[PDB]
Each structure stands twice: as C-alpha cells, then as structure tokens.
Amino acid sequence: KSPNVLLQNLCCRILGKSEADVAQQFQYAVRVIGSNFAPTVERDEFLVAEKIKKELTRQRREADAALFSELHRKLHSQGVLKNKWSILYLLLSLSEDPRVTEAALVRDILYVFQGIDGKHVKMSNADNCYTVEGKANLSKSLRDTAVRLAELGWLHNKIRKYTDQRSLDRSFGLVGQSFCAALHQELREYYRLLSVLHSQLQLEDDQGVNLGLESSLTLRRLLVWTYDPKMRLKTLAALVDHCQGRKGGELASAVHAYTKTGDPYARSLVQHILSLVSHPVLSFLYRWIYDGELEDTYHEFFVASDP
C-alpha cells in the first residue's frame, strides 16, 4: 500500500500535475528510493537533536532551539511516532533551505543547578563547593560526574547571591542596577533551560522506554547539555569578579576592558551587556548635551557639578 500512496501524494501534491499526467517523474523518484532501506549506524534522535541545536546556533536562534527542544518534548510525550529520526532528518533538510538510581542523581543535580542543595549531594562550605554526601551509596564515577556538573551549580549560586546583593542596594547607582538587571537576562535562559530539562526528566509517566521517553537521561547527556551553560556561567562569574568595585565610568571601562576577549560567543555576549549598560550612560550624555544638565546622587558621570 505504501509506495502507491506515496507516489500519488508526492505527485498530486508536490507538483500541480497529477501522477496520471506526468509519468517519468514518479518513475525517477521510485527508482531513487528503490533498493535503499536504512543506515546501519546508530539511529538515536539525540544526535540529530543536537545537530538541530548546532544548526539553530548557526542561525542564531537559540530561543528557537529551546522552542524546538520543548516541541520535541511533546513529540516524545505523544508516543505516536516510531521513526522520529527519519522525519527529523527530513525536517533538517527542509529547514536548511530558508536559513541510588541515576534518576535520583539527575533530579538532585537539577536541584543543585537551580542553586539549592540536592539529596546526597549538598553545599560543603568546608569545601566551599558541592560535595556528594553518602557517596558510598554510589560509585566514584557517579560522584566525579556529579562534581563536574555541580561546579556550574556553585557558579550559579555565586552569581545569584551577587545579583541579589546588587538588586538590594540602591546607592549602587543606576548603571549598577542596569548591570544587575542585564545579568538577570542570562539567568532567564539558565532557568528556562533548567525547566526544559526538568520537564524532560520524566515527562509525567514512563510512557516510552524511560522517563516518558525512548532514551534514558544520563550524566553524559547532562554534560553535553551543560557544556555551553558551563562556559556561559564561567564568563559571567569572571565578569562579576572583574567589576568588584567599579562604579559608573569605572564599570563602563571595566566592561569595555573585558569586551576584548576574542571569543565570539562570549565576546558578543559581553557586547550585548556593554550596550545595555551604556544605554543609561548614553541617556545621561544625551540629557547633559541637549539639556546642559544631568542630576545624580551616586555620582557615576564624568562631569562633576559644584553646589
């Protein structure tokens, strides 16, 4: 039944000519199709999923990448598809044109990544990091992977505390508050990536093979998931340590100093942050020019006015 309906649809639909009007076209199509079954290599949808992620990053649509990830969540939720690999590859081709148990371990590591201690893994302030408690329950490999992951959680906790402090004080100046708010923009992506991962953690029931899915999540999966987030948080922690006491023009120079890294990912992120921070500075300059005056309490401008 397959090939006949395939040819009929692909002729009457793709072309405005029916298969009873043009004959050799479907012949060439079926002969190209004929004598081919499937690749013998691994057909896991994870590989094509991160292929799509890479392509979307090449298209600078990481928001779209997250959206596609969530749609993949529902696609696995339904359980109505058995050959997602092939359809995903076809969609890739089309879209190119226009452009304790490891489950508990991963749940706890997610919890940590949200900035709060998990179970059997917690903030050891004696180590001033995250440490596996009751590691005899697990193996050395599990705890090593957990520590490698939870480095990101410790950085997240650091940045969250710093941003809370800077959101608290008001004598930190308008530029400092703008910096903190922009810092929260990246926290937003952090958070919704975490939400995507939590949603995919189990779906809602074991509908497929595992976690409501056909493939079980593993530490290695979380590793590739956090690769980019890890470097993002490393860059942000470096930035926050850099601007320890920089206020106003001080901070504006400090950030422009860290604008010279040369990592186009990180460099573009820093440029976005610098643009956001300078926007209040630009408004200050425009007011000082057009109005001949700008009023401040936390003197962050480069013009000092005398009483």
């Binding site: 994870f46 090593d144 290695r220 590739v224 470097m231 100093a257 010279k260």
Partner: protein, 207 residues
C-alpha cells in the same frame, strides 16, 4: 604550575606594554569488556573508570592512566592503544583552560574556543557511544573502529596545542604554526580541514 607562570608572565607583559588590561580477571570476557567499556566511557570525559586509576601526572604532559593489574592481556593491550584519547583530551582541556587569560591575546584566545567547539562534537560522539552502550550493542572492535578517526583528530589537535605551548607562540607565530601545520599535513583531508578551520578562526581577529 607552568600554565599559571606563563599566563602571569604574559599578563605582566601586556600590562607593561599596553598600560592597561570480584577480580575482573575472574569475570567472563564479555563482562570484563563491558566493565572496561564503561570505564573508558568515563575516561573520555576525564573521570576515572572503575578499574583504571588516572596517573596524577599534571604540569608536565597530558593525563595518563594506569589500568588494574587484573586484566586480560589482549584487553590490556587494546586499552593501552586506545588510551591516547584520554591524554589528548586532558591536553585539550588544559589548553582551553590556559587560553582563558586575556594575556594570550584574542588570537590565541579565539584559537582555543574554536577547539572548544570541536570538543563539543567530540563529546557528542561519546554520547553516541554511550547510547550504543545504553543499547548494550557496543563491542571493543567497533569502539576502536569508531574512535580511530577521532583518535587521529585528537592526536593532530594535541600536537598543535603542544607545539603552541612549547613555542610559547603568540600571534603570528601561532599563525606561523598554522601556516606550517597547514603544509605539515598535506595529503589528508583529516588534518587539512582542521587546519583551514583554525587558520580562518585565528586570522579573523588578526585580519
């Protein structure tokens, strides 16, 4: 040790110039192979396998490993031949960590990030492997078959990193290496692809 001193020196140079800135042998052969497969999967990310201890040799070369003495001769040989993946990954990790400081200039900086991106896809392959391992469909023969290209690529990149480190190359000297290594590996797309990628990436800031 060496990396910290180098980065400190070149930060000071930048400041001076720019005025700113059960026994496994008792186990059946299949079980032993599976255990070692999981261990090497761990090692790929630089975490220890259950029957292999990483030799804590750092600051002189990449991370090497020592297997347990209870291991089949053939499997021990195979793991010996396949180990250089681990050391090459430790080398690239150390390289990307060291280029963190801005004192290496953007050109060197943008260098490592490029390899960082490659690191990404490397881990992707590992994930593939672990998926196959999740399927229980992985054999050491096929593991080696898959890694052989990855083995060669990691060897190439480790050699490039070691050359840059030993020469302390910065700027066009790195590019000179890129100019040289481009010709150094004529006759194979395996190395020429990466050489072209790295030349483009490094030259973009210098261009």
């Amino acid at each position: 040790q060496q990396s910290l001193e180098l980065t400190r020196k070149m930060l000071r140079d930048k400041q001076s110039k720019k005025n700113s800135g059960v026994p496994i042998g008792s186990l059946p052969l299949a079980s032993q192979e599976a255990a070692v497969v999981e261990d090497l999967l761990y090692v790929l990310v630089g975490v220890d396998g259950r029957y292999i201890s990483a030799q804590p040799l750092t600051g002189r070369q990449g991370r090497t490993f020592l297997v347990d003495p209870n291991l089949d001769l053939s499997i021990r040989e195979l793991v010996s031949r396949i180990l250089p993946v681990a050391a090459s990954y430790s080398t690239v990790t150390r390289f990307i960590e060291e280029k963190s400081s801005f004192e290496y200039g953007q050109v060197n900086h943008a260098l490592a990030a490029a390899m960082r991106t490659l690191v990404k896809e490397y881990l992707v392959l590992v994930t593939q492997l672990e998926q196959l391992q999740r399927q229980g469909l992985l054999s050491l023969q096929k593991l080696w078959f898959y890694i052989q290209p990855a083995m060669r690529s990691l060897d190439i990149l480790a050699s490039l990193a070691t050359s840059v480190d030993k020469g302390e190359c910065i700027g066009g000297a790195t590019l000179s290496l890129l100019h040289d290594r481009s010709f150094s590996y004529t006759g194979d797309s395996q190395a020429q692809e990466l050489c072209l990628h790295l030349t483009k990436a490094a030259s973009t800031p210098y261009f």
